Amino acid sequence: QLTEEQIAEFKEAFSLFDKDGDGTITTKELGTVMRSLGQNPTEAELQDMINEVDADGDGTIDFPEFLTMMARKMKDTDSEEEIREAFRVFDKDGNGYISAAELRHVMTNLGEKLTDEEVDEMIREADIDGDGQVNYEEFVQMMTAK
Ligand SMILES: [Ca+2]
Ligand SMILES: [Ca+2]
Ligand SMILES: [Ca+2]
Ligand SMILES: [Tb+3]
Known part of the structure; x- marks a missing residue:
């Protein structure tokens, strides 16, 4: 439902x-x-x-x-493979890190004008550690955070 x-x-x-x-x-x-x-x-x-x-x-x-x-x-199994590409797909640096800046770099080319106050908040609002950046470890948290 x-x-x-x-x-x-x-x-x-x-x-x-x-x-x-x-x-x-x-x-x-x-x-x-x-x-x-x-x-x-x-x-x-x-x-x-x-x-x-x-x-x-x-x-x-x-x-x-x-x-x-x-x-x-x-409603089914998941493959960490998809979480890797998608994630690494945004970190053009291939470093596996997405800073409030990098994210705004790609998400920006999407064709939609976003605000820094929002992005900075989102990334900082999800970062269980609040490091202003998201790490591969945090990515799992969301999926591991009830
Ligand atoms: Ca990086
Ligand atoms: Ca079409
Ligand atoms: Ca961090
Ligand atoms: Tb169809």
């Missing part, structure tokens, strides 16, 4: 993925989005990637499947 408060937040993600507002996420748009994220996925990956979110193999993604894909993860 997904609460509305959750179903809403998800909507925000879509508008971020489907810039065309067609109502379906395609590979051409997916790669383009990940291509600007500093990532360089292969053709076999992007195409095969959609499959993961495409259980019906229709060639596109909808709301029911868009949430299921994310929700499912919460």
Whole structure:
């Protein structure tokens, strides 16, 4: 039973993925989005990637499947591999560290203007140690913090 408060937040993600507002996420748009994220996925990956979110193999993604894909993860096993790439995917420094600055560097290219007072707070609001920066160890805390 997904609460509305959750179903809403998800909507925000879509508008971020489907810039065309067609109502379906395609590979051409997916790669383009990940291509600007500093990532360089292969053709076999992007195409095969959609499959993961495409259980019906229709060639596109909808709301029911868009949430299921994310929700499912919460209702199944997880691979620290995804937490590594995504995380290291932001630390272009390959150092594995995301400072309130670096985060603002990438999250900024997203195409949305964010405020420092917010980012600084978020990162500092999640940093169980409050070091103004997030470490790989902290990343687990969130998933290990009931
Ligand atoms: Ca589209
Ligand atoms: Ca770094
Ligand atoms: Ca720290
Ligand atoms: Tb589908």
